[PDB]
Amino acid sequence: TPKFKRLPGHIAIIPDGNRRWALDRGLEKHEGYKHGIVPGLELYDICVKIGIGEVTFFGFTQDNTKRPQIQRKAFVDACIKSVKELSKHDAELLVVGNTNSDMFPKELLAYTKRTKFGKGKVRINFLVNYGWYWDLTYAFKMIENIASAEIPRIDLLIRWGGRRRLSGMLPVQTVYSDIYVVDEMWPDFKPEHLFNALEFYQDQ
Amino acid sequence: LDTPKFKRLPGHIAIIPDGNRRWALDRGLEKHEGYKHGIVPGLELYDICVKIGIGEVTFFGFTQDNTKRPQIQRKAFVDACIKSVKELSKHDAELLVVGNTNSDMFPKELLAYTKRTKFGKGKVRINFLVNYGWYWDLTYAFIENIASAEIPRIDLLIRWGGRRRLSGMLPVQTVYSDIYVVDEMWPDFKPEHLFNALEFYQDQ
Ligand SMILES: CC(C)=CCC/C(C)=C/CC/C(C)=C/CC/C(C)=C/COP(=O)(O)OP(=O)(O)O
Numbered sequence: 025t026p027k028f029k030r031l032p033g034h035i036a037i038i039p040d041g042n043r044r045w046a047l048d049r050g051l052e053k054h055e056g057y058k059h060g061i062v063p064g065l066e067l068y069d070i071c072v073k074i075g076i077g078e079v080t081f082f083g084f085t086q087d088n089t090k091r092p093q094i095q096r097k098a099f100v101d102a103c104i105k106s107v108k109e110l111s112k113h114d115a116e117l118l119v120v121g122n123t124n125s126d127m128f129p130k131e132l133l134a135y136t137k138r139t140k141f142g143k144g145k146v147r148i149n150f151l152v153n154y155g156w157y158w159d160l161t162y163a164f165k166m167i168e169n170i171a172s173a174e175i176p177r178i179d180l181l182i183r184w185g186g187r188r189r190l191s192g193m194l195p196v197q198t199v200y201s202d203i204y205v206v207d208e209m210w211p212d213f214k215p216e217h218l219f220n221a222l223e224f225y226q227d228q
Numbered sequence: 229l230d231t232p233k234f235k236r237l238p239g240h241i242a243i244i245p246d247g248n249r250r251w252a253l254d255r256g257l258e259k260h261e262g263y264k265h266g267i268v269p270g271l272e273l274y275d276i277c278v279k280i281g282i283g284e285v286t287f288f289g290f291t292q293d294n295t296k297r298p299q300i301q302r303k304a305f306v307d308a309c310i311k312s313v314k315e316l317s318k319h320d321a322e323l324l325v326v327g328n329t330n331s332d333m334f335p336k337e338l339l340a341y342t343k344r345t346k347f348g349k350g351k352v353r354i355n356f357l358v359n360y361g362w363y364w365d366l367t368y369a370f371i372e373n374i375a376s377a378e379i380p381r382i383d384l385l386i387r388w389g390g391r392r393r394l395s396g397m398l399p400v401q402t403v404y405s406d407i408y409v410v411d412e413m414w415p416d417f418k419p420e421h422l423f424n425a426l427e428f429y430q431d432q
């Protein structure tokens with residue numbers, strides 16, 4: 025931890041660039057995702073160390089499942105293992121997404137109710153088979169009964185992979201979020217990417 | 229000097245003309261005196277969009293929240309939005325104004341434009357968010373029927389004044405929008421800020 029005057033209460037993480045990162049190392053597109061797991065657990069350890077209270081990760085969307093079977097199997101395998109591995113740490117875990125779909129991994133149904141593991145030092149949410157449209161229409165006030173209601177306002181959204189967009193992430197929680205874009209692919213996560221985001225957040 | 233030849237152009241551009249106050253404060257003027265310097269920047273962006281063939285542009289006017297600003301700022305920013313709409317109506321715009329008309333803070337002069345109106349040769353659709361609120365927009369539905377339903381998906385959002393936030397502009401229409409932040413304040417608008425945004429959009 026550098027010393028901070030202020031931290032965001034709730035950080036959202038879009039872990040993008042897994043496929044470009046793979047392709048670049050000479051692998052098949054879908055082999056990138058498994059290299060996204062250790063960076064996830066590293067971001068989480070730092071959040072805990074510096075005192076970030078809540079983190080939401082963009083797992084995958086309904087649209088993402090459109091992609092070829094072999095990519096889908098892989099980024100689903102990586103989400104399961106990611107939630108599995110976060111469960112061995114001190115995390116309050118919540119998975120949000122459309123469970124009324126063959127595309128929601130059965131192995132993650134267990135974490136659709138927020139669950140404390142160890143001391144529960146940081147709330148982790150996970151968007152798995154998430155759709156913005158599914159989310160808003162879930163209600164049909166209604167804004168308090170959206171599918172993503174258990175996930176509060178996002179102060180800071182950090183997106184790896186160089187693209188500046190939400191890709192349909194939590195349009196209610198993101199209406200006022202600061203947005204920091206790291207050009208490096210997610211699997212190239214370094215602590216300094218988080219410290220740079222938090223340095224931007226507080227100097228705002 | 230020369231107008232860049234783009235491989236690919238967004239069909240719908242969003243503008244967040246921020247920095248009017250900081251701009252004035254930097255010049256030693258009063259906070260409120262910046263807004264009047266916002267109209268030529270906007271008409272010039274309009275004429276470039278007509279030349280390059282951008283079919284649609286939405287401007288973020290003021291939010292419901294913004295009306296609680298010191299009276300002298302609100303008068304200035306209301307008056308700029310009214311000027312901006314009257315002026316464009318003299319230059320071949322199809323104008324649509326979206327905002328909470330059921331409010332004393334909805335400027336009466338813009339009730340003429342709450343249904344989309346072709347003026348002259350209708351060279352580009354221009355939209356204006358006035359007395360607008362994301363919460364008001366979405367709960368209007370009590371999602372084809374949100375207040376802002378006649379404003380389509382945004383391809384590219386360009387914000388002046390270096391803040392990296394959506395500031396509640398059109399949550400639904402901005403879910404997949406590429407976002408480009410110009411650091412300079414809106415009154416310092418340069419054509420090259422638009423070409424920089426377009427070079428960015430093209431490159432995705
Ligand atoms: C289409 C044309 C011609 C131009 C429209 C752009 C204009 C005229 C801008 C000024 C009016 C406007 C939309 C104001 C928004 C309302 C508020 C409260 C804005 C906050 O002020 P700011 O963000 O400009 O100032 P700041 O960022 O604090 O320095």
Ligand SMILES: CC(C)=CCC/C(C)=C/CC/C(C)=C/COP(=O)(O)OP(=O)(O)O
Binds near residue numbers: 044057061084099103
């Ligand atoms: C939760 C966690 C930390 C896990 C990391 C991996 C993961 C499951 C996230 C990405 C899922 C996905 C469908 C992204 C596709 O783009 P891309 O980013 O893979 O590839 P591209 O940007 O190179 O096209």
